[PDB]
Design a protein around this ligand. Sequence first.
Ligand SMILES: Nc1ncnc2c1ncn2[C@@H]1O[C@H](CSCC[C@H](N)C(=O)O)[C@@H](O)[C@H]1O
Ligand SMILES: [K+]
Ligand SMILES: [Mg+2]
Ligand SMILES: [Mg+2]
Ligand SMILES: [Mg+2]
Ligand SMILES: [Mg+2]
Ligand SMILES: [Mg+2]
Ligand SMILES: [Mg+2]
Ligand SMILES: [Mg+2]
Lengths: 191, 208, 86, 323, 137
Amino acid sequence: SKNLLKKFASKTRKKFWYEGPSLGSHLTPRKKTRKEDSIRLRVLNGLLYKSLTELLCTPQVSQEVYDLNVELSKVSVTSDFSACRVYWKTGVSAEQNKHTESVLQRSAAYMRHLLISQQTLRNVPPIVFVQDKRDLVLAEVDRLLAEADFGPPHPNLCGIDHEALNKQIMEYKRKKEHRDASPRSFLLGEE
Amino acid sequence: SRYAPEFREPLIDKEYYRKPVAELTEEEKYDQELKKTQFIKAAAATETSSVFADPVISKFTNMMMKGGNKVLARSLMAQTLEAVKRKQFEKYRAASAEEQATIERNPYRIFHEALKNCEPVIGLVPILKGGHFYQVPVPLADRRRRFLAMKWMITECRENKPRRTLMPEKLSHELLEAFHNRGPVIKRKHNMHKMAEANRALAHYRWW
Amino acid sequence: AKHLKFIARTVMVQEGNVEGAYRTLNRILTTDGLTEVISRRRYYEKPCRRRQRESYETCRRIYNMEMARKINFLMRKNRADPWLGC
Amino acid sequence: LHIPVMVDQVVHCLAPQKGQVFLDMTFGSGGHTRAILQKEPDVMVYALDRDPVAYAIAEQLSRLYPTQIQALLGQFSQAEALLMKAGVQPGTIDGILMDLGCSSMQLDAPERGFSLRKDGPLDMRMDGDRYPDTPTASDVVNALDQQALASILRAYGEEKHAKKIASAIIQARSTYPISRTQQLASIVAGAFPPSAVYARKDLLQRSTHIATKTFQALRIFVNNELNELYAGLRTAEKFLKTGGRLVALSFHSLEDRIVKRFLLGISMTERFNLSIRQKVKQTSVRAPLKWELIHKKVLTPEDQDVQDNPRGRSAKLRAAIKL
Amino acid sequence: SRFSLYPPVPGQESSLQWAGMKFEDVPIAHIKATYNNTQIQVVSATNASLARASCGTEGFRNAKKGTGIAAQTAGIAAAAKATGKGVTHIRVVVKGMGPGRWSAIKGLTMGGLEVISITDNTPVPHXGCRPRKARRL
RNA sequence: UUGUUAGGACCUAAACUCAAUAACGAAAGUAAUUCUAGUCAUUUAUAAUACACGACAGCUAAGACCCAAACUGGGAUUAGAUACCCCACUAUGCUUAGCCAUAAACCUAAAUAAUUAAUUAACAAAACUAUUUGCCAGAGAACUACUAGCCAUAGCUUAAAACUCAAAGGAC
Ligand SMILES: Nc1ncnc2c1ncn2[C@@H]1O[C@H](CSCC[C@H](N)C(=O)O)[C@@H](O)[C@H]1O
Ligand SMILES: [K+]
Ligand SMILES: [Mg+2]
Ligand SMILES: [Mg+2]
Ligand SMILES: [Mg+2]
Ligand SMILES: [Mg+2]
Ligand SMILES: [Mg+2]
Ligand SMILES: [Mg+2]
Ligand SMILES: [Mg+2]
């Protein structure tokens, strides 16, 4: 009789859904921007964010990776869908991050297998693990700072050039001291 | 440029070409075979196989040249090196046997260790955020770190010297003072680093 | 207040990995919805506002879950071309 | 008569006491200076003004207190030299009172040209015969082009209608010289229809003339009060004792901004946004504050009192201690 | 034969000790992480105050008082006072969801204290007091 | 003041998760738990000048008071800021009696029984037949003037004309 979902069913149907049995060219393993592509890539980034967190903090990948307990900063797939860029949260310790980077990357192939096997995502492209460049720079600006040595222990204000205006005044003081488209032509015979 | 992108920079290392074939890494061995089917840029007028050619000093010469006067700029560098060699020989002869050991009389080695003492690890980039100019601590590359040391030297001598002193006499007196970590060019490095600590928390504004 | 302390929302640190334990506690609170609940209790959401948000989030979850099904369903046919050249 | 407005707040803020040296950079009629010398008869005070008439008033009033008040004549910029000629006797000044605006005597007297309501020559110059070559408002209106003249109205008078008002002056001066205050008022009131002559109601809920902004603009430009004020506050800080209390009264926003920005470490140089994407919030500073603001909180006089002195309605009292 | 995330059940007998004390005896580090100030207090298992700190007491002011690095300094300060009093193991009950929620726990670790567990006690009313009105921006 | 209390009091106020549910009721509205009372048969549609209801705000008297909060005061911002932001605190939101009778009270869908083909103005929510009542007749003037009724008195319901215009309005 009264359905709360009716209010927003038609609005969310153009924002979060497209019609027709068409899959994108990118989504294949091997142009003009479309709205369906934005939907087809937004949902994958959410599924992979949900599904790639069910591997890092779960025991399937490995015992060391399970112990790593890697939370993820964000997941973002390329528009071409050639590969993925799984950003991961990066602790302050640079050395540990370097080791964690290598560990995750080695299991990238197996992690993909785990998702593809479970059937959450049928055709997942190769995965990558990247460190946020912002985080790396902030760490580097701290490393170099520690290494670094600090050594041994009026008219223009208001906006009117009062001086120039005074000269202009003193200088002045020195001087002081729809019709042709009708059928008329056709109906007369002027051809 | 009149060179097409397919041209390769020339390799002017005399020993590299005459090395025995087995002494070359296969990566280097592969490049040599590839280069046989490529175009090579002509060598620069100042690019030679001379054993006395130092890239760092040649670069420092070009940063002093004004209006393409290479003869004058090279003469100024030649006079400087000599003024440094003559200044250390005087000290060496007028020093005890124990002190004589420490004294360094190589001008080429005083120049390189001088510049390296002036190089700064971190620099600053000027940024206008919300209509206010802020300079954020940046980590300097190997190229930016080297350029700043040479630029700071050529600017202390050009400007902050007496009117009748000459560049071979101010530059020689500064390479040696930087060589001992006492000069004003070193003081510029210390100020740059000290300011970075002041703006330590303002690096977040970086977007590049 | 009348319950027992240190049973609810408590995690134990393993081998002095205090960061790993904190990361686990956050996933527990986020999964149970406490994080979202505490976020929205800072200010007051009006009853009409609350209903509009819940109806939109429900419809967004339906269309998202349905779009996942359609991609997964249509991704089975995603394979090397068998009739290359025709 | 014009009672010194908000003098009680100044007197309490200054707390004039024996053995303290004070300065007044705007003696004028001397009402404020006399109030400081009444609370404490043993206080030491120095007076200054740009008007030779005002200086004579101080010299005449120096008989009342032979050494407690010291009279001086000159601008804010020339104040440092005048106090330097005296020597180090001002030295560590406990308080500098920088009241602003036109003197009660200056604007009450029609001959001085400050009053548009009365008919007098268009002098509008606080300086008297001390400098006879200082251009008057008559020279300013008759000499400057629309571009220059409009900027004076827009920048110093906050004139909303700057191009129309400026053009009327340029046309009127060509027809006849603009030499009288009422002549200029009619010229400004002629750029618009007759309805707008007396229409611009104020926050007071009292109507005002349409050329009040032109007289304020010319008053500040002829005497360059704003630029000279920038140097007066800077010289007061130099001559202000550490722990000394500064007290200023700002009757319009332009002077208030310089006093408001100065006492909070902000700079008048700061560029201006123009009602597009202003970052009041972001959805920092070179150095910290250099003052202990006894009364950062500002207020106008009481509305009942304002009726008695409408000229002082917008008086904002800004008090600070040197750091 | 595995580690249990679940705290030793109170009232029973367990095989886990820390410096010869049971779980019920380890001192507690109460961290209140708000959006402006992060306070920290350490108490004994009998509810006796041992250390106290906060971004404000360390000397931060205004918006600096509510940063991650400000809470880290406050945690290091609380650790040092507690370490002097004779504390090596702490149970971290972290109330609040502010910026220095984690940083305060990191400072305590940097200060030489060994956290054995982390509890969360952020107040969650079950229906309670009407929150203040939404801010318009 | 603050933090902790596996200390005491309070029973004011409001009912997380469940709820990704779509139930109950004429509508308004209603979801912490328990118990008591309780919804039900007129063939069906069709009612006002009658009767009984009717969110929130508001009024009347006596209480309550954790938190929220018109107004007001204080602080910022601004050319100004009677605002947006910060802080404090009222009317008020609560209970018990009575009044008030208004909502974008909107599924912007009167009810009921059929049909899905011999049917695209557009958009929304596919089209369409029959029955009964209500309502509409260019826009503004006009949720207005006057009239009558009303616990309503700066109120509600009922509701014009002069005069002005050649458009107003809906969808794409
Ligand atoms: N730049 C400047 N330098 C010096 N005096 C100035 C000045 N600008 C304005 N004045 C003077 O300062 C006074 C401000 S109005 C008068 C206030 C004075 N305290 C009194 O009791 O009368 C006037 O006398 C005015 O001529
Ligand atoms: K509706
Ligand atoms: Mg206010
Ligand atoms: Mg109340
Ligand atoms: Mg109605
Ligand atoms: Mg409703
Ligand atoms: Mg109405
Ligand atoms: Mg009516
Ligand atoms: Mg009526």
